[PDB]
Each structure stands twice: as C-alpha cells, then as structure tokens.
Amino acid sequence: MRQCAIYGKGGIGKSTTTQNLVAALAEMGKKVMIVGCDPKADSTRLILHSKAQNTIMEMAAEAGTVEDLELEDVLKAGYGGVKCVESGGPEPGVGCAGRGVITAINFLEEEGAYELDFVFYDVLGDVVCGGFAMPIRENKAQEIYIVCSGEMMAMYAANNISKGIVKYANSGSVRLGGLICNSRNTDREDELIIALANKLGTQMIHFVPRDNVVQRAEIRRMTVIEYDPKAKQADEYRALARKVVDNKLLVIPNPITMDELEELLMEFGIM
Amino acid sequence: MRQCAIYGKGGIGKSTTTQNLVAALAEMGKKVMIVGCDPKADSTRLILHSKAQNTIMEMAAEAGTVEDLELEDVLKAGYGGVKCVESGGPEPGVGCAGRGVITAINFLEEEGAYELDFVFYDVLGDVVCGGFAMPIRENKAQEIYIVCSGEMMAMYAANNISKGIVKYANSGSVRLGGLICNSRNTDREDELIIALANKLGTQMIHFVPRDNVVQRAEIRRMTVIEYDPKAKQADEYRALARKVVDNKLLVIPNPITMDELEELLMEFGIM
Ligand code: SF4
C-alpha cells in the first residue's frame, strides 16, 4: 500500500484532478481509498455521484463521538470500487482542521479500513500550518504530490508545502513525488511548472490540460474516466495514473525564496 | 478607537480593498493602524510602498524572541500616517497561523501601540479555524467586515466567517458590520451580494467595482487614494470609508445553509 497526499491551494481544480486520477487508477485495477481532509469536503463527490458525502465530523456530532460511529456510514464505495471518506472540516472559528483529520485517520485505522494499493489524502494547501500538515507530520502520507498552476498563489502554496515537507523530511520518510500542473489555459504554464519543479529538485509528473469534458462530467457528479472513457482527457488522467504508479523519484525538495519565484514568473511572462 | 477586522478568502483583492479603505480613512483625518494577519503578509505593502514588510515572526526569529524586539522595527508608518504591522505567518507545516496573531497583538499591547481612531486586522478567511478566528475569539476585533464576491468560494467563506461571528457573539461583543463586494465584473454580482447580506441579516455596505487604476496603483506599490486622488475608484473607496465610519448596524448574523447558498447562486445566474 502506498500512502500519497495530494496537496494544493483551492480553486484550481485539485479535487477534480485527484478524483479523476483515482478513477483512472481504479480502472487499472488498483484498490484506492480517498480521504478528503478539506474543510469544504468535496473530495469524493465525483466518485460517489453524491451531492455531499456525510463527513466524519458531522456523523460524530450526530452520534456524540467517533467511538460510537460505524465504518459503513463513514466509508462509501464509489466508481471502480474506490472507497471514499470525508474527514470533515473544523467548526467555523473554533476547531482545527488538523484535529478533524487526525480523528478521521485514527478512526479509519481503528476500524481497519486501511487493511488496498493506494490511500490518497486530498489535503488543502491554501495555508500550510501545523493542522493542515498533519498527514505529513504524523507519517500518514509518504508520497506528496502538489497540484499547482502558473499563478503566483499556486506556486507559493507549492513552495510552502515543500517547506513543510523539508521540515518533516528529516527524522521522517515523507518525500515529494512530483508536481501536477492543473492547466488554467495560461501560456507557457507547463514550462513554468517544469522550471519550478527543477528549482524544487522534483519533477512535473504530469500536465493536466483544460477540457470541457471535465465540466461535462462534473455536472453529472462524475469523473471523466466514468463519463467518457474514450475522451482525450480520460487518456490524460490514465497517463497521470500510470506515471504515479511508476513514480520512483521521491526527493526532499529545495524550497525557493520569494525573489526566485518572482524571477520565474517574470521569465515565463506572468508578472 | 474602533477595532475592526477585514475577513475574506484570498484571491479576490481583499488586501487591496482594505489598504485603499484605510488610505481613504487617513485622507479624512482618521488615525488608522493596519495589523496584517495573513501568512503571506501583503496587508501593508501599498501603504508602506514596500515589496514586503518585515513581519513580527521574522524579527522575533532574527532577535531570538519577541521580548528582545522594539516597536520601531515592528511598527511602520506609511501613507497618511497609517501605522502598519505584519503579524507574521506560521512556520510552514509546524505552527498555527493564529498564534502569530496572538503574539503580534500581545506585543503591540505591551508596546503601547494601541493608544488611534481605527485598528484594522486584515485576516485571511480561506479556512475559518480557531487560529484564524483569534481576533474574533480574543475580543480584539469588534466590527467584522467581510470582503467577498459573486464567486461560490467567496460566499462560502463569508458564510463560514458569519458562523464564527455567531459562535463568539453570544458571549462576546463581536458583530458583523456588513459585507464588502469586491467586484469580479460578474453580472448581477451586486444583487447577489445584497441578497446574501439580507439572508445573513446584515447589509452590503459597499460595492467595490473593478478598475484598471487599482492595478496601475498596485504596480507602483501604492493605493489609488495616493496614486490618483482624482480618480473614480478613489471616490468609491472614500464612499466605503465614510460608510464604515458612519456604520451603526452591527448584527449577529444568520448563516445560511448549503441549499440556501446554492439557490442564491441559481437565482442570479451563477450556478
Ligand atoms: S493549526 Fe492551522 S488549521 Fe489549526 S487552528 Fe491553527 S491555523 Fe487553523
């Protein structure tokens, strides 16, 4: 079993890319589990064809504690047999995202859900703090893949996630597997992300293009793999899945300074 | 002295709106202090004409601890006498973003920097956790203004911040003074934000349009008030400032559910 975490800032289609990648993995015969560690809890909608999956936090609140919770309600099987579970966001203004994530992971481990080829933690990378770095810090995810784009905020979040990895890459076995470039139809975006990965010492594992079929499948609460298996974007997600399966470059990144990031953006025509 | 917090998700120009509002306030004769509570620390650049102001956490690290710091290096005066502080983001992957704010506010209180007509805490509202809600929880900010837009994520963040205000309003005195609509050139965006404010039990205090002069001023690292005083956007920021000064409608919000927000987006042609 491989423990991978997809990190990245919100609003760039990270969850859709994660779900389509997991669907492509399931289509290859891999038993994949998705754990959504996002407060929005949108990391399992496409696999489950659901408007909203009941997160562990909400069901614990309805049942008092996670101790009186059942894995059958917590964990749901979606397309391709993919198991789906939502950690649940913090209480707005009160709790930590990290406490919800660790509670979900501990409940899953106690219930025996992990006993699978891949476990993907879809973790928010908008802010890189102790709470959102729980999978990295508690040795829950060993391979970190960052979904980014050719915009200042996306690469800044990627660099901060790399800083967190570097913090926990010593006295720990968590490594950066690569960068997934979610295209935003920006010119020289793939080249910019390749250069950013080279600066970080990692690779751009795959460049995910923008396609209308992604939104067409998302209207149906479905992945591109399930919706149109013969689409070109399905082949892109299959290539990403194969490159993640065959990924051997797991490195401790070298985070860049702010000036280097601005220089990269100037070089590739963003600012 | 009025203690206010500008909350809101990132990527919608909340920081620029806050800095222009503070510049318009100082242009009317009010003594304002900006406390930047975002980890990326861009809340005081346009006032100070700086690429990036040195944050409290950085100086604490360079000087060993906060107790070896001086207000001269921490507190900087920019355009119109506005006093600028950056709280300092957490160490990526380790610290909590809300304890840097605790440290900054405590240090400013010991240094006597709070004894001023307005204090504005620019607080990021991407994730509404116990850390990022420190000014609301610790009773440091009494009036909350949420900068939002017609996009789904901005309205979701506004609803979550309203939930936090509700949690801390039945025990403290923190209230929501209105919603600031940061236009994204979306059709029926002002009407949608007005409807959201009416559902929350509050008001859309001002509609901030999109203007190129905002970007022209930001390139020069200054606000529109200082760059082009005779511009229309400067007048919009002045209207927002005088509506903030004259604001008396401070309410405990009524946060709306997922279905209500989705139906609001459906009504005005966004979903
Ligand atoms: S550690 Fe991060 S998620 Fe947890 S309360 Fe602090 S800022 Fe919020």
Numbering used by the authors:
A (entry chain A), B (entry chain B): 2 to 116, 119 to 274
Sentences from the paper on this structure:
Nitrogenase catalyzes the ATP-dependent reduction of atmospheric dinitrogen to ammonia through the reaction shown in Equation 12. The Fe- and MoFe-proteins are both inactivated upon exposure to oxygen, with the Fe-protein being the more sensitive of the two4.
We have built upon this literature and produced an mPlum-tagged Fe-protein, wherein the maturation of the mPlum chromophore can be used as a visual marker of oxygen exposure. The tag is placed at the C-terminus of the Fe-protein, which is often disordered in crystal structures and is positioned remotely from the [4Fe:4S] cluster and the site of interaction with the MoFe-protein. This strain is able to grow robustly under nitrogen-limiting conditions, demonstrating that the construct is active and able to reduce atmospheric dinitrogen. The chromophore of this protein tag requires molecular oxygen to mature, and can do so through one of two pathways, resulting in either a red or green chromophore. During nitrogenase expression in nitrogen-limited cultures of A. vinelandii, the cytoplasm is maintained under reducing conditions through high rates of cellular respiration. Thus, within these cells and upon successful anaerobic purification, the mPlum chromophore remains immature due to a low cytoplasmic concentration of molecular oxygen. However, upon exposure of the purified protein to air, chromophore maturation can proceed and be monitored by fluorescence (excitation 590 nm, emission 649 nm). In consequence, the protein sample will visibly turn purple. This construct allows for visualization and quantification of oxygen exposure throughout the purification and all subsequent manipulations of the protein. We developed protocols for use of this setup in the reproducible determination of high-resolution structures of both the nitrogenase Fe-protein and MoFe-protein and of the MoFe-protein:Fe-protein complex by single particle cryoEM.
